[PDB]
Amino acid sequence: VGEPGVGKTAIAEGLANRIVKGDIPSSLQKKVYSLDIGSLLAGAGEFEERLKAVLKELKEAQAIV
Amino acid sequence: KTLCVKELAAFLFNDPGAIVRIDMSEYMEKHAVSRLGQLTEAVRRRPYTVVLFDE
Amino acid sequence: RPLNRLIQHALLTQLSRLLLDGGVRPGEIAKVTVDQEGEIIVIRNHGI
Ligand SMILES: Nc1ncnc2c1ncn2[C@@H]1O[C@H](COP(=O)(O)OP(=O)(O)O)[C@@H](O)[C@H]1O
Structure with a gap:
């Protein structure tokens, strides 16, 4: 803050x-x-798939962000 | 919540490898009626299995 | 979650390296104690 x-x-x-x-x-x-x-949101549904792929590798590897 | 599931099929079903994992996170869509195809077809070839609903 | 993160990095990683150069020989003991910093360290016997 x-x-x-x-x-x-x-x-x-x-x-x-x-x-x-x-x-x-x-x-x-x-x-x-x-x-x-x-x-x-790069380039000119799709947002829900890219958000899940990023928030998944951090959970299985245990890392901050 | 993980060891209790692995010991459920390894003791009763005598097979620890008969455990499926359904991560309820990417299936949050509107077309999840005639597609989940995946869970029904998996239990058809193996009636003795443990279905896990993660999250 | 820090279970396998600490064991596989401070207890299993250091022990696996001593089994190659000659730190832990098949026939002795593996002393695991806490150093002065406050971490998990394996007291090696012989050198490289
Ligand atoms: N104590 C510090 N030492 C060195 N660099 C600093 C320090 N505090 C802030 N900065 C610099 O200020 C920048 C702040 O960037 P950021 O917070 O992303 O946006 P903004 O510039 O609008 O605050 C950082 O790139 C960082 O390099």
Whole structure:
């Protein structure tokens, strides 16, 4: 929660840096992704199929987003 | 919720591999009447099975 | 969910590597304790 322009993306960028190093336990080293809601509507029903395929690989692999 | 299902067919039906998984998530459509074809045809070739309705 | 995520990465991964270089030989014991950091580590015997 913050003003539109405080650095919301940088919060997740710093957490991924500690995973590569070694300051994160192996039980918490999860893959960080950027769920883009606009990428699902690429090109000129279909939205329900692309949304389920993305929200499925993260559950079977246990990773944050 | 997973070990209780695997032990159900491995003890009563004497076969842990007779367990189907129906992930109720992608079937949320309007044409799921004459298509689910999938669950009826699977239990026809094997009357001794366990049907799981995940989510 | 963190069950298989921690065992297969901090208990089964380190033990599988010692079975190749010569860490755990078929005939000894596998000591599993907690290090000073607070994770699951396997006390190896011989070296590489
Ligand atoms: N403490 C910080 N150190 C380095 N970069 C930062 C820090 N805080 C914010 N930023 C930068 O600010 C940007 C914020 O981007 P974002 O939150 O996506 O949109 P907006 O620029 O509108 O806030 C990030 O790309 C990040 O690189």
